[PDB]
Design an enzyme around this catalytic site. Structure first.
Site, PDB file in Angstrom:
ATOM      1  N   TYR A  35       1.655   1.256  -0.511  1.00 35.75           N
ATOM      2  CA  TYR A  35       1.750   1.190   0.937  1.00 35.75           C
ATOM      3  C   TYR A  35       3.179   1.435   1.395  1.00 35.75           C
ATOM      4  CZ  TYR A  35       3.916  -3.471   0.846  1.00 35.75           C
ATOM      5  OH  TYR A  35       4.762  -4.535   0.639  1.00 35.75           O
TER       6      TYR A  35
ATOM      7  N   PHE B 140      10.213  -1.117   7.370  1.00 36.39           N
ATOM      8  CA  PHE B 140      10.539  -2.434   6.855  1.00 36.39           C
ATOM      9  C   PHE B 140      10.079  -2.665   5.426  1.00 36.39           C
ATOM     10  CE2 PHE B 140       6.693  -5.084   6.572  1.00 36.39           C
ATOM     11  CZ  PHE B 140       5.761  -4.269   7.178  1.00 36.39           C
ATOM     12  N   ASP B 141       9.175  -1.843   4.898  1.00 38.49           N
ATOM     13  CA  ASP B 141       8.682  -2.081   3.550  1.00 38.49           C
ATOM     14  C   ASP B 141       8.118  -0.786   2.991  1.00 38.49           C
ATOM     15  OD1 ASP B 141       8.019  -3.320   1.201  1.00 38.49           O
ATOM     16  OD2 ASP B 141       6.658  -4.796   2.083  1.00 38.49           O
TER      17      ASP B 141
ATOM     18  N   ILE C 168      -2.119  -9.713   4.243  1.00 42.48           N
ATOM     19  CA  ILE C 168      -2.353  -9.859   5.676  1.00 42.48           C
ATOM     20  C   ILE C 168      -3.719  -9.269   6.034  1.00 42.48           C
ATOM     21  CG2 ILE C 168      -1.089  -7.728   6.216  1.00 42.48           C
ATOM     22  CD1 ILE C 168      -1.319 -10.986   8.279  1.00 42.48           C
TER      23      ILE C 168
ATOM     24  N   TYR D  67       0.953 -10.766  11.202  1.00 47.91           N
ATOM     25  CA  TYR D  67       1.657 -12.046  11.237  1.00 47.91           C
ATOM     26  C   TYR D  67       1.711 -12.616  12.652  1.00 47.91           C
ATOM     27  CZ  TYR D  67       3.183 -11.142   6.454  1.00 47.91           C
ATOM     28  OH  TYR D  67       3.222 -10.923   5.099  1.00 47.91           O
TER      29      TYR D  67
ATOM     30  N   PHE E 227       1.125   1.378   8.777  1.00 47.96           N
ATOM     31  CA  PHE E 227       1.102   1.490   7.326  1.00 47.96           C
ATOM     32  C   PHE E 227       0.634   2.871   6.901  1.00 47.96           C
ATOM     33  CE2 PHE E 227       1.825  -2.859   6.023  1.00 47.96           C
ATOM     34  CZ  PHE E 227       1.485  -3.580   7.144  1.00 47.96           C
TER      35      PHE E 227
END
Lengths: 107, 903, 128
Positions: free
Chosen positions: A26, A36-37, A56, A82, A99
């Site tokens: 991902y 962010f990721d 999540i 979140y 994503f």
């Protein structure tokens, strides 16, 4: 809530049902385009068992919809994200997540 | 706040030498069609996804410098408004991706068809995926400049250019009226595959720094001759109106007599037996007197050019004779030379240049006429489609046709010269084709500041491949990137195009070089001398001294530096490998000199001046412009005020100024569905933000623009107005019609200040300061403009998540020019909350120190990457066409500025 | 050695400008005639810089520097010292014979590594 926007179609027949690990590379992004990721920087796929609520909820429901080798996109609303508390230190509260989901393999 | 980092792939663009455009009286066709086929694409070679976009671009500002830049790096097609591309899932433009529904939509995979259709009659760019058209077309986009195909790719792709004809097959019938892109190649040049305007390319012995590439223009496709109508025909010309026509009535016929094209009494011209050398009386009367008045027309061109005649010597009529040669003998009414005969006569170079431009003005009138009958250019001749391979201006024509036109009129001017009538050259006026962009012409390459030397004897070779404007020498570390070397004390350089040395001006020194000359530069900080060696020979000044410069202070230090003019190539060998040097053994080695990078593992990092404008703050020491930060009062908010100190004095700088604030405003993620006191229940929940500008008296509102700009504004135009604003609207719909999305996108959003002043009879020096106000709503994405607090008809709608910088462009015309008033009105929230997130509920207007007034530097320094993408571009086959291949990955760690959205 | 006599003989220097002034030697054409054909006040009467002898010395001095070795540099500056100590040909040779092991070491400076790399990189060099 969660909607899928296919980037590259997979096989369309093998879908990960309840009871098996979901292996995925991902690439999470914020609503403003600031990433962010990711997982290819770590060069290790993100293996999470399906249905065990280890991820999540938005990612959880999105990962079931597509099939093997399907590059897709997921627009995680704050409801299934979140949300109210965010991720402490990384994700600000009440933010939309995007994503670049890629379910590479199943076990 | 904090700068963010990431690893970002190198992205490069590749174009064919096919440029198209539209203009008044253009010689081109505004309908083109090219295709790109995918061979191999790796989904993820690196952490970031492999980049691949195909589309169009623009020749007047699309400069894809590798590495960092706008957005999040890897800039290609669609990052800025000079490019229009389609990645396979989105229509990229202005660094924004917009999803488009397609029949089988996915990212570009192997065996995918990318058919690009461009109609320039009405601005429209169409894409087709595997025959099925992509349901989205660009509209209302800028057309000034040229359009060319471009593919932007990261490492690890193989693509093919299907340009049709001899350069592919298109694998699909092109839409009717659209021509294959291989038909737009200029006659002089041969098609090849090259990148966009660059600064470096591979070399045999070493990498060659590349001076900017000369770019063709749309204005170079309109044939603009000198008008030959308002010319009263002189007596000395009507006196010679006959012989100069008689000598060009069968001059084209003289060559082919006694060959397969030998005349016959039964037929006439144009019947594969053309000559008919007898006379023009036998030939048809209309074309006959047409040929007479074409000879007169050439003489009228001579008049308009500046040619006048005078008779001195013996009349050539006496000492001229007609020669009945054994060749060109005919049975039809005797034999004679087909034109009028002439004896030994010569021509000076003035006549050669004059006949050259005379043929130029013949060709450009012919081309103008053909265009006025609808014709256009195509590299393959199509008579029923009314296209020709020679409908280009003379300067772009081929040498064969140039010579063929020049031969006839050379004979004509020779016949004129024989009669002794002078061919008088006109006056000489020096002109420059392009003048505004003085900065694109000069590119300055220098070593990094960390390599600065303050002692020793240093030598480096600058092998000038070509023989253009190349200034090479040593420059101090704080050298400015936009001023020519030698104009200040900051650079001691030698110019070799015309042989001088530059420091605060010019003075004669040395001899200008030729091609392939290795210019070796000495520097000796012991005795403080600078010496130049050309091909192992020491250059000499206008004396016995062998030192170019002397008594040079140590200062901060010196760096190797070189510059290249447009269309120039030079090799800058810093002597990293001692054996690679050529003239070092001849000079320097025995003199104790050292290679500049003799013991260095990595190559010397080069910093090159980037002529891409970037808004930067104003130093307080600026000579002409200054910015005042005045504290607020009880009645007025604090203001930022711009004044012109040197205005009204000698040698003042007056020019187009681009000015913007130092902080952006971002539109919200999602938009809403479908006396003089602020009301507390309105000012707290309002979503509208406003700022005012007070154009002072003496500053003409007709040269003032007010509005907002996105952070990708890099338009440094000397003659800027609302017409030069970049804008494009994306039209999106389903498969058949039903446009369900038509969004207006731009980088510049400005309103002309001259539309807010009453056009009175006299009194343009208004005693009232024009207070232009701008309101922006971040919850809807709309914005308005107020001329004097009263709303105007202008408005703009922008998409969400858009960053806008408050900008006001102005040409200064007074001591008091402009004052930015970061104010507020009744129930309207000031920009003090639209800028700083921590002050969202503070209605008090403030101007904190971070908020600052920035103008636009046209040129800023940049760093050359140590390695570049290895790209193979070659013609795969007769039917495959040109192929692009890139395999080796290369990643660059780019630091990103958050608010300016540039890394 | 002729230039050694030139420097060591002030009389040869004194009548050198004599010969220049009665022969009207410009010393500019003699050094710039080639530069004139290549298409490129203070001591015009006579000066040290216009001395044709020091000119012919400096024009081909690097031939002499070339034929020596880079490890002999420190031998050159110790010979600068002895020549400042007014030592002539006889005693400089024997002192250098004492200083035979005083020659420079290539490992002592990085500049000597590349200097020897190019010095044997010339094809006309023999180690003997």
């Amino acid at each position: 809530g969660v909607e899928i926007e296919t980037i590259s179609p997979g096989d369309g027949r093998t879908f990960p049902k309840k009871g098996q690990t979901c292996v995925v590379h991902y690439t999470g992004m914020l609503q403003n385009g600031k990433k962010f990721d990711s997982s290819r920087d770590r060069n290790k796929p993100f293996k999470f068992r399906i249905g065990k609520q280890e991820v999540i909820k938005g990612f959880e429901e999105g990962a079931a919809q597509m099939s093997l080798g399907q590059r897709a996109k997921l627009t995680c609303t704050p409801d299934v994200a979140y949300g109210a508390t965010g991720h402490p230190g990384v994700i600000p509260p009440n933010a939309t997540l995007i994503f670049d989901v890629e379910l590479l393999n199943l076990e | 706040l904090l700068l963010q980092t990431n690893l970002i792939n190198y992205v490069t663009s590749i174009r064919p030498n096919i440029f198209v455009g539209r203009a008044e009286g253009s010689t081109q066709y505004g309908k083109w069609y090219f295709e790109v086929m995918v061979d191999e694409v790796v989904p993820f070679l690196t952490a970031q996804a492999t980049h691949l976009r195909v589309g169009w671009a623009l020749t007047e500002g699309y400069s894809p410098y590798p590495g960092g830049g706008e957005g999040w790096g890897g800039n290609g097609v669609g990052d800025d408004l000079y490019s229009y591309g389609f990645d396979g899932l989105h229509l990229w433009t202005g660094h924004v991706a917009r999803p488009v529904t397609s029949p089988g939509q996915h990212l570009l995979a192997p065996e995918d068809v990318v058919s690009c259709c461009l109609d320039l009659s009405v601005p429209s760019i169409s894409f087709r995926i595997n025959g099925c058209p992509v349901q989205g077309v660009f509209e209302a986009f800028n057309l000034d400049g040229l359009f060319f195909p471009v593919v932007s790719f990261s490492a690890g792709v193989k693509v093919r250019f299907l340009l049709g004809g001899r350069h592919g097959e298109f694998k699909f019938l092109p839409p009717p009226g659209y021509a294959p892109c291989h038909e737009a190649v200029l006659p002089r040049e041969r098609l090849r595959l090259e990148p966009i305007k660059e600064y470096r390319r591979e070399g045999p012995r070493g990498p060659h720094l590349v001076g900017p590439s000369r770019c063709l223009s749309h204005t170079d496709f309109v044939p603009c001759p000198v008008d030959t109508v308002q010319i009263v025909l002189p007596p000395h010309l009507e006196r010679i109106r006959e012989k100069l026509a008689e000598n060009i009535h069968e001059l084209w016929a003289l060559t082919r007599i006694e060959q397969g094209w030998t005349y016959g009494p039964v037929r006439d011209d144009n019947k594969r037996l053309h000559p008919c050398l007898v006379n023009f009386h036998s030939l048809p009367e209309p074309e006959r007197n047409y040929n007479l008045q074409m000879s007169g027309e050439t003489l009228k061109t001579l008049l308009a050019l500046g040619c006048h005649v005078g008779m001195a010597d013996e009349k050539a009529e006496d000492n001229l004779k007609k020669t009945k040669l054994p060749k060109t003998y005919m049975m039809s009414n005797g034999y004679k030379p087909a034109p009028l005969d002439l004896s030994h006569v010569r021509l000076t170079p003035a006549q050669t240049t004059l006949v050259d431009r005379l043929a130029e003005n013949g060709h450009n009138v012919w081309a103008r006429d053909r265009v006025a009958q609808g014709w256009s250019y195509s590299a393959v001749q199509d008579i029923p489609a009314r296209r020709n391979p020679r409908l280009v201006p003379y300067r772009l024509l081929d040498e064969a046709t140039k010579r063929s036109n020049r031969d006839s009129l050379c004979q004509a001017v020779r016949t004129l010269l024989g009669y002794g009538y002078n061919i008088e050259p006109p006056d000489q006026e020096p002109s420059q084709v392009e003048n505004q962009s003085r900065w694109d012409r000069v590119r300055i390459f220098r070593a990094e500041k960390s390599y600065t030397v303050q002692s020793g004897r240093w030598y480096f070779e600058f092998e000038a491949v070509t023989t253009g404007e190349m200034r090479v020498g040593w420059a101090r570390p704080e050298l400015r990137p936009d001023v020519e070397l030698g104009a200040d004390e900051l650079a001691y350089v030698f110019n070799g195009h015309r042989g001088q040395r530059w420091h605060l001006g010019s003075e004669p020194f040395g001899r200008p070089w030729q091609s392939g000359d290795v210019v070796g530069c000495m520097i000796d900080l012991t005795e403080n001398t600078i010496i130049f060696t050309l091909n192992g020979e020491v250059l000499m000044s206008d004396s016995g001294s062998e030192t170019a410069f002397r008594e040079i202070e140590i200062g901060d230090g010196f760096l190797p530096v070189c510059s290249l003019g447009p269309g120039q190539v030079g090799h800058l060998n810093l002597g990293q490998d001692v054996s690679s040097l050529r003239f070092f053994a001849i000079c320097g080695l025995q003199e104790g000199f050292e290679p500049f990078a003799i013991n260095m593992q990595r190559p010397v990092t080069t910093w090159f001046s980037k002529s891409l404008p970037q808004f930067e703050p104003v130093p307080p020491e600026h000579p002409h412009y200054e910015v005042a930060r005045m504290d607020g009062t009880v009645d007025t908010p604090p203001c930022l005020r711009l004044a012109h100190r040197t205005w009204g004095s000698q040698n003042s700088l007056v020019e187009m100024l681009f000015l913007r604030l130092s902080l952006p405003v971002q539109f919200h993620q999602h938009f809403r569905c479908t006396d003089n006191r602020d009301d507390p229940e309105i000012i707290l929940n309002t979503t509208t933000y406003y700022y005012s500008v007070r154009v002072f008296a003496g500053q003409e509102p007709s040269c003032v623009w007010v509005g907002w700009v996105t952070p990708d504004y890099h338009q440094h135009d000397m003659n800027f107005d609302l017409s030069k604003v970049r804008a494009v609207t994306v039209t999106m719909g389903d498969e058949q019609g039903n446009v369900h999305s038509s969004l207006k996108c731009s980088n510049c959003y400005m309103v002309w200040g001259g539309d807010f002043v009453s056009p009175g009879q006299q009194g343009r020096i208004s005693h009232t300061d024009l207070v232009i106000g701008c309101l922006v709503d971040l919850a809807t994405g709309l914005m308005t403009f107020t001329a004097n607090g009263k709303e105007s008809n202008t408005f703009f709608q922008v998409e969400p998540n858009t960053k806008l910088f408050p900008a006001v462009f102005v040409l200064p015309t007074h001591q008091n020019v402009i004052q930015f008033e970061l104010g507020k009105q009744k129930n309207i929230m000031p920009l003090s909350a639209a800028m700083f997130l921590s002050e969202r509920k503070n209605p008090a207007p403030q101007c904190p120190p971070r908020l600052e007034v920035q103008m636009l530097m046209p040129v800023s320094w940049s760093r050359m990457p140590n390695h570049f993408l290895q790209v193979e571009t070659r013609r795969a086959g007769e039917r495959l066409g040109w192929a692009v291949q890139c395999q080796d990955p290369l990643t660059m760690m780019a630091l990103h500025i958050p608010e300016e959205n540039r890394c | 050695e002729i230039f050694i006599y030139w420097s060591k003989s002030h009389n040869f220097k004194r009548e050198e400008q004599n010969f220049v002034v009665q022969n009207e030697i410009n010393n500019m054409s003699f050094l710039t005639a080639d530069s004139k054909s290549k298409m490129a006040r203070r001591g015009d009467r006579y000066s040290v810089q216009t001395s044709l002898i020091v000119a012919t010395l400096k024009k081909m001095l690097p031939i002499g520097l070339n034929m020596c070795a880079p490890t002999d540099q420190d031998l050159i500056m110790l010979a600068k010292t002895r020549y400042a100590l007014k030592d002539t040909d006889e005693e400089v040779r024997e002192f250098l014979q004492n200083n035979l092991h005083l020659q420079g070491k290539v490992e002592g400076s990085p500049s000597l590594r590349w200097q020897m790399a190019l010095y044997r990189g010339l094809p006309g060099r023999e180690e003997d």
